[model samples]
Target: VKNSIIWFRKGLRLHDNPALLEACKDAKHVYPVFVLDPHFLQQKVSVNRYNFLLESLEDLQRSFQARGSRLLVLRGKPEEVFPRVFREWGVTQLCFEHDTEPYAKVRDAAVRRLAAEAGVEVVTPISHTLYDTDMLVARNGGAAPLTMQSFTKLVDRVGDPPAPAPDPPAAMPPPAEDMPSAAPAATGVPTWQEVGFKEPPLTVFKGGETEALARLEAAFQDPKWVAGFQKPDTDPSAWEKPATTVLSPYLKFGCLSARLFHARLLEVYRRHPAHSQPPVSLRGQLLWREFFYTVGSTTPNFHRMAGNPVCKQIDWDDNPEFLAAWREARTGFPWIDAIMTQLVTWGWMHHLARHSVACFLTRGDLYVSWERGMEVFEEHLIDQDHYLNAANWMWLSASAFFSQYFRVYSPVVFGKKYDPEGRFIRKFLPVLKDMPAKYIYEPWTAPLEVQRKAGCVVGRDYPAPIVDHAVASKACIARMAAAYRRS
Candidate 1:
């Protein structure tokens, strides 16, 4: 009759959760708890995440209640908090899913030390990722796979991930009601104000484990859609509905089970062996996420170019004026500004849209530091995971993971290729909504008469182009060439 505590971190869902399932296995009493680190709550972007997390945790609480248990949330550093929690509950065991973020690794180590001191057995299992990153790195002979081909090859050797755990028990051991609540102040989940911010209006993306599974179910209904999906072919500009499955935010928060998604894709492939394969298929996209997680977790200084062996350092312009314009979505480049607006307002953007803006921030025009771009994205993106954000910014900036500095994305032409009429721009940038199709992207070049007719005057209603694309692009490329030569 052991007492166990399941600590929920990123993995919020009940289905296929090895940690939660394991806690209930041999325990007479099971307490599911979530510890809130004040450091995480103090971030400016916490408002966006708080609203999302509020819904997610509330959903999880309902899940626990349905299983005859309670979700006890506490606020403080884990080292100070958990020792007391372990003692009060007469905890004989602790459980949680494995996480690979650099910070998470250190945090888990401290907890394991505490568990050992308290004579509590800890059951931690890999659930967030398809495979243990440590195992993948070991297979590579103590080095991370640097390229997609290399990553996939090692994955082939590792074979497919284990089948996801079956659904949890219909009922579980109840919370210890007789035990005095050490954290009585824990009043369910808190709102945005609890984290010191006004709640944002209902966003386009609502967060919950229930929603995550529902979306996946709908996507699976169209098996052909799942089988033939190619990420590159998806249109970022076609609004109303995105061309690809919008699952990253759910995946980021661990509301959806990564193994379950991988398993479902395998089922689809088994039925339709001719289905589109990796690097472009839906499964390939997940593998890309896995690739970065493995790479970033193994690398030191993965966040910045300085002191990072993998990154090639290029001296970039330190222009606050340029950065501010870009950040506030007044860059005078309609395509870039609109994408930024979407990101700021919606905390998410299409992957190609990310590529376009990231390119503009670094090699395309501003030639600013990728670190700065990475920081802004970390603040703005709802799906911001440390490894993926850092790696993508590096890849986009041609600093690491990729090196095609000459491949400049034309802000004007790139958007037009997907959306010639600037529909995506108009949705996010209302000032240019009425402008004619040809002039929508480059409003500055439009005749004054055309500007008047469109009801959006360039350089007045909208800011003028911050820099000449042709001139700035060539300059940026020259600097990149020099950096490569020196490297």
Candidate 2:
């Protein structure tokens, strides 16, 4: 006789969803709903991300339909939508995956109050992250472990994470027969254009539980590759067939469960005794996500340098020209521009590619605020996890987590080290395709005759490097040093 509502958010999939399982238990009717929050609508999200989300929802809707259920696509703020649904549908219970972001915390708190006043039992299970971040913080004496060494040690002390919960029953409880006339009809998933974005071109990353599980199974087919996977060893320049498993976007959207991935990795490791270890291994990558989530959950102002206790208070410059140059992929350094072009075109980039660009924008050369760089990433990246995005930007900028201001990623040397032929650059920046291998990374250094023969001219066909790496990086290092000293 119980009516339940399972509100979908980050955790989109039915597998390993503890909250969904809870909602289905002993329920006569279950309503699965996704709120099209205006808060997200107002943000500077890319069309690619919007498409991914919509597609994921479409896939989810199909799953619900297959199980004799419907995923109600509600439009409005959760505050307005939930109370109305509660009153209309006579919901006795509410369940959803727990979110740890700053905004979600406040929003969920309010929703819990609303559910309470309605006499609805609410169940929020932690599945977005591997371990409960609050528990990690509490165990660390109310502070997040700031260093990888300390974080790993704390994790080891906590033992293994709980095994992922089972998938929901094949047949779910049907929606209630009686519906409010004013309630928005469940019209299936909308197109990208319907959400006010142009239909995105075909993207490499397909979003949803179906694609996510397929990708996971495909990657695990080669156990050696899975067991020996190392993050730093992966080639950032290989876009045609990405060297690493590009499971990040799936993990970000919760199309794939983190605990399930962790369990699979352990299975691989157990068989391959000589598997790579963490802080670099595939499992280690998940731990890094956990690390950021824990710190982000506990730290006030985790997204900004100002009022952020852990972030270094550097007097970062407000250079609009430099910022725009970096954002538009015209930074002049072929390596830097190529990475930006890839990001702009694909809404995704290799982790190291991100490191190179992030460094170039912040502490490396441009000396602009990491906040500016983070905003551009927030707008474009398909895999943009708010906590990880901010944490990594801070680390790359030497604003937090990392203190080695002198260790700069050379835009030319770093790319050339991984890709000598500059194929990645040519693929993203066609203007550089004709440049010589010798001058591919530093195209401006090519002789005029060479430029003419290549059918591209530096400063004409392509922009000259915006800043001198030698001069700009040196000055940046000095400024960073001074900032550190002042701090």
Clashing pairs in 2: none
- Cα RMSD (Å) between model 1 and the true structure? 1.5
What's model 2's overall lDDT? 0.89
lDDT per residue, candidate 2, 1-487, as tens digits?
A: 7999998989989899999999999999998988885356655888888788888998898899899998888877899889988988889999999998888989999999999999999899999999999999899898889999899999999998989999788899988776862243543567777677765645678889999999999889999998888898899999988888888889999999999999999999999999998899899999999999998888899999889999998988999999999999888888888888877778899899999999999999999999999999998888989999999999999888899999999999998888999999899888778888999988888999999999889888999888889999999999999999988
TM-scores for every predicted model: 0.97, 0.97
What does candidate 1's lDDT look like per residue over 371-446, in tens digits? 8988888877778888899889999999987888889999899989889888898888998889999899889989
Return the top candidate by lDDT. 2
- Measured on C-alpha atoms, candidate 1 has an lDDT of 0.87
- Candidate 2: give its CA RMSD in angstroms: 1.6
